[PDB]
Amino acid sequence: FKQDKRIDFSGDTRPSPCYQLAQRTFHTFDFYKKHQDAMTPAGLAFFQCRWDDS
Amino acid sequence: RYRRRAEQEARKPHWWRTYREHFGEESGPKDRVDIGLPPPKVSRTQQLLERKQA
């Protein structure tokens, strides 16, 4: 995303080690609602992954 | 030639029950909400000429 003015958002900030799964719960929709005016979507790259030993 | 004309016909929206209708074309027509980075500005005559020469 491109942003116009530097944005800081405390609601999005997470603890440093952050192992817990419920701490990471996301909706791109709501996130982009929050920052919409300053944020314009730009690049896209995606990869497909399946279970492995690690 | 027959093959081509055939597919051309198969792509047009006929007024009778058709394959496309029952098989889930993913909504068919959708009016896109486009959140883009604005289309890169280019003069076409320059491109055309440079390409012809290349």
Place this chain on the structure above:
Amino acid sequence: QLRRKAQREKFARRVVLLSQEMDAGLQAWQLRQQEKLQEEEGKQKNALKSKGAL
């Protein structure tokens, strides 16, 4: 007299039942339509802003 009073009452009961169910039917349809017209605007309320501009 007795049995006629009984059956006339049956007839009345049923006129009231039918009329009431017809009015209830029409109310229900109108309600459904207004709700539909309202969902159409709910679409506008939810939509993301297009950042594509000429």
Place this chain on the structure above:
Amino acid sequence: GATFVPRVPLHVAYAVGEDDLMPVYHGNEVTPTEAAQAPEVTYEADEGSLWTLLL
């Protein structure tokens, strides 16, 4: 509902060894082993720039 056209080139890569680079292309299959480490990113902008990236 929404479509964004991917204007800017995005190169995401995982290092699988000292000499070995695993590319992430749109649509490719990658193993959790190579994703056990943090990726490196390449795209080009001068500095007036302000960016936010997400995985």
